[PDB]
């Protein structure tokens, strides 16, 4: 999904709000902040209502201005609540009644997702690959800066996982694939307009093709 969450490479932001080794305060800065992650795990591990991938996607589905004005942990309160409503576990009415006011949720998905591709290639370390020049409206773990770009494999995972573009929509056809650490030269991604050296993106097999 080419949403505002796909931030890598966006220009115009100011300074990162941190200097090295500065105090970051407690893990949680408010008494509710452990709730989104804990309730995500209740949903995933206890209820089996959704996958972690579905949580990433429902956050991506926040209305764009809403996403941009909402602090991190709050996005996950909104995301988990949305999933609970979408899965028929909770109603928005009861959330707003208990909250004592408006509890707007993420927008409905505009894509049914897609299955893990049947045709993919097993790559080896040192091999050159291209990121498939594809556009996916639902969940995908490919940041746009690498779409259609060429890099070199530095790792093939020794485990396999469901294809996010499927499991992120709760589909039954996510299969399993390994991922690849694909090393790109900074200039392959941003031309002359970068001060870096290389960028390594951890890409599912189904996002790749031989160069």
């Amino acid at each position: 999904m080419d949403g505002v969450h796909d931030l890598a490479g966006v220009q115009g932001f100011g300074k990162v709000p941190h200097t090295v080794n500065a105090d970051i305060g407690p893990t949680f800065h408010a008494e509710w902040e452990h709730l989104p992650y804990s309730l995500m795990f209740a949903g995933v591990a206890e209820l089996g209502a959704f996958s972690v991938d579905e949580v990433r996607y429902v956050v991506e589905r926040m209305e764009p201005r809403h996403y941009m004005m909402t602090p991190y942990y709050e996005r996950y309160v909104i995301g988990v609540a949305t999933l609970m409503v979408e899965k028929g576990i909770l109603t928005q009415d009861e959330l707003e009644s208990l909250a004592g006011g408006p509890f707007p949720l993420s927008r409905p998905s505009e894509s049914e997702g897609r299955p893990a591709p049947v045709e993919t290639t097993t790559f080896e370390v040192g091999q050159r690959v291209r990121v498939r020049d594809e556009y996916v409206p639902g969940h995908i773990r490919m940041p746009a800066y690498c779409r259609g770009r060429v890099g070199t494999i530095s790792h093939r995972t020794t485990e396999k996982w469901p294809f996010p573009d499927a499991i992120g929509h709760g589909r039954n056809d996510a299969g399993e694939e390994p991922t690849y650490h694909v090393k790109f030269a900074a200039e392959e991604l941003f031309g002359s307009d970068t001060d870096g050296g290389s960028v390594v993106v951890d890409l599912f097999e189904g996002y790749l093709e031989p160069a």
């Binding site: 931030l7 890598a8 300074k15 991922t179 001060d195 870096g196 390594v200 951890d202």
Partner: protein, 191 residues
Amino acid sequence: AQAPVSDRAWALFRALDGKGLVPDGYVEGWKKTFEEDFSPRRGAELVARAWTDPEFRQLLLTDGTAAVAQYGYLGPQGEYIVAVEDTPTLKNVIVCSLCSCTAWPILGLPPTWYKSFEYRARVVREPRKVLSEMGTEIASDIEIRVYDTTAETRYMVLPQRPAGTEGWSQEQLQEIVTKDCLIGVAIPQVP
């Protein structure tokens, strides 16, 4: 318009808890895990061991998962681990441009700054400037490599061991390996 976030968060809890969907002590247990168990002190321990034990260093760099499992530090968002090695000509830095992906059990939950739009947008494209602004100067004779945590690999940086720490104990070494060193935005400093 929105109700206060505290009210919305507790509403979500109460809605689920009131339907019997949240086990007794469940969120409390997670809070304890997040606050007390997941800690960069663990990653520091791993680094200090790798610095003083060539055999473990080799294991950590070739099978991060196995190395971390030896210490019992695998966990949620830290089940497949890859450690990335700084060298005299290479500095590694980790981000999750798409959200906040972090090796929780060994780095701790990500700090606000790491989850910031500023870090997520900028470090992939201008890591040298970002690190410089944060207080870490990386010379031009050094390759910066940014790992974007886009799938299930969860990363830690194995930073270079600073001169002046020769002979130090693992406990002494652990003290200078901070959260920021594990993420890769800081280089360990001799106090």
